[PDB]
């Protein structure tokens with residue numbers, strides 16, 4: 073199988089749909105990656121994650137390097153075997169969570185309490201047996217001074233080269249996995265340009281848009297995507313990290329994004345929030361106490377085929393694990409169905425109408 | 437289909453194996469009933485409960501009557517449709533949990549804060565659409581004075597008649613469900629005899645042994661079963677409520693018990709305890725951190741087919757829901773496999789050897 077082969081099947085405006093072929097499977101783009109925090113997509117067996125339509129999941133370097141530990145997972149056969157997901161896994165580099173969850177920053181890297189460097193990040197992702205390795209970056213806090221944004225980005229660009237070289241010098245990794253670079257630059261077009269320039273110069277299999285969804289509202293996120301995604305190599309996937317709500321996803325695909333990860337469907341699922349085509353609902357609301365309809369009237373997921381709002385309402389209010397299970401399965405299924413609808417509509421050259429139709433109904 | 441038809445296929449000593457045919461399915465005996473507290477077997481989809489081999493599950497009158505409420509569940513189509521379990525459900529009467537979880541006792545019944553009477557218990561079980569209805573009883577605290585034990589039992593026997601009559605006067609219920617009487621009498625052979633006498637006189641589809649596992653160690657529980665189960669009608673099922681550990685189950689079947697319910701496999705599963713043929717293990721123990729073997733080397737369950745001790749160790753220590761899910765599925769599967777082994781061995785007239793072999797290995 074191919075290491076990493078991205079093919080664009082169809083375009084509409086800035087939107088693209090296609091496939092990333094990897095050794096462990098095909099990723100249909102635009103893709104949503106369920107996040108699997110500590111070697112589990114919370115409340116779901118991998119077979120259920122797969123059943124919802126996920127082609128790839130996200131693993132966290134930061135969390136796994138602490139618990140159970142990267143050497144330990146490698147000893148146990150790698151993350152795929154450990155958690156029983158045999159399809160592609162993208163691992164974040166730790167760059168974001170080390171600052172958000174732990175800290176002393178330096179040129180060599182970051183030292184913390186719960187040294188993570190580009191090299192060590194790559195190595196850990198190696199030990200995990202990640203299929204898509206993220207370069208180790210610094211997710212510039214928002215907002216930030218232009219000079220601040222610029223030296224922050226420039227360090228990440230230096231760390232991107234280091235990541236590239238560390239990755240390349242590990243033959244197994246280089247032959248079997250992919251490496252993505254992460255664009256930073258905050259909300260600054262010139263810094264974003266600079267960063268894309270550096271990344272493209274170094275060369276990556278894919279390019280993420282880092283440092284968004286970190287304080288910027290949707291309007292501002294979209295404005296930054298409007299100029300930032302065109303700076304990335306067209307012929308490589310574009311990954312918007314940590315985004316987002318269904319409408320964030322639709323608008324980002326309209327701006328050229330091919331890949332997404334977000335904790336929202338899993339986390340808000342556990343918290344009672346179900347996504348529906350008519351917008352989110354909070355299943356704990358007393359209005360659902362005797363509602364026999366499924367979470368979503370159109371959803372094809374197993375939850376919606378079998379259980380009512382009323383039942384899931386009861387479960388979540390009772391703090392029952394099955395409630396978290398069913399809410400999560402539905403929300404991830406919903407997200408996957410959204411992605412499918414997105415892919416099909418771009419394929420068919422009716423994505424613009426879809427986005428419009430989606431938005432009308434979702435916000436109504 | 438039959439309302440309630442119990443057939444004994446094979447005997448060995450006091451042990452029996454056979455089948456209870458009901459409208460919603462066949463129950464193979466000796467049977468273990470997973471407990472489904474608030475309309476869910478914790479951490480398991482009903483399809484998974486079924487996959488483990490459960491033929492019937494237990495529902496709680498007390499919990500459901502408070503949340504979401506019996507009228508409400510009936511309005512929503514009954515407990516089976518609500519929770520998506522279409523096979524038999526045995527509902528406890530509330531007699532035990534009203535005292536243990538809530539209280540003022542009287543002849544008419546019990547009034548509490550979180551009036552439950554025999555009639556109201558039956559009615560609620562009716563609204564739930566229970567297949568096996570338990571008479572409303574009083575689970576005599578242990579230990580207790582003989583006079584105390586005796587008036588407690590005598591009230592339950594009066595409540596048993598009331599339960600019988602309430603059940604019978606509801607034609608739908610009488611035609612489609614079964615009613616079990618509950619023997620009390622504490623640890624007193626004469627009171628147990630009295631109680632069996634009263635129950636048999638009233639007449640039930642099945643007879644439970646109530647008031648055990650409530651302070652009595654195994655030796656004492658077994659001593660009480662030694663004289664109490666022979667007092668029950670042979671031709672009806674014998675249900676030991678709230679029991680128990682695998683070895684409790686084996687010894688109780690050796691004493692004539694046909695049915696069991698216990699929260700142990702689910703609750704201790706969530707708590708890190710896995711049952712294995714070599715005894716329970718606490719998967720949180722550091723010794724399992726790199727153990728690639730399944731929870732149990734012989735277990736046929738899906739968990740043991742796919743995930744290692746090491747992984748489940750990690751999940752449970754991380755407080756991950758999937759950990760609770762996999763631990764529970766395995767433990768319920770284990771219990772079901774135990775019951776199957778019990779049934780097969782009685783069928784084959786090698787149950788005595790099995791019990792011996794089971795015990796040797798389990799306690800070793």
Ligand SMILES: NCc1c[nH]c2nc(N)[nH]c(=O)c12
Pocket residue numbers: 164165166167168169206209210211212254281282283284285286313314315
């Ligand atoms: N939303 C921004 C973001 C999410 N995850 C991230 N991971 C990394 N390494 N860098 C980033 O900027 C981000």
Ligand SMILES: NCc1c[nH]c2nc(N)[nH]c(=O)c12
Pocket residue numbers: 528529530531532533570573574575576618645646647648649650677678679
């Ligand atoms: N272990 C005793 C027991 C468990 N569940 C019970 N439910 C009822 N109604 N009565 C009882 O005595 C018991």
Ligand SMILES: [Zn+2]
Pocket residue numbers: 367368371372373374375376377402403405406
């Ligand atoms: Zn659904």
Ligand SMILES: [Zn+2]
Pocket residue numbers: 731732735736737738739740741766767769770
């Ligand atoms: Zn197992």
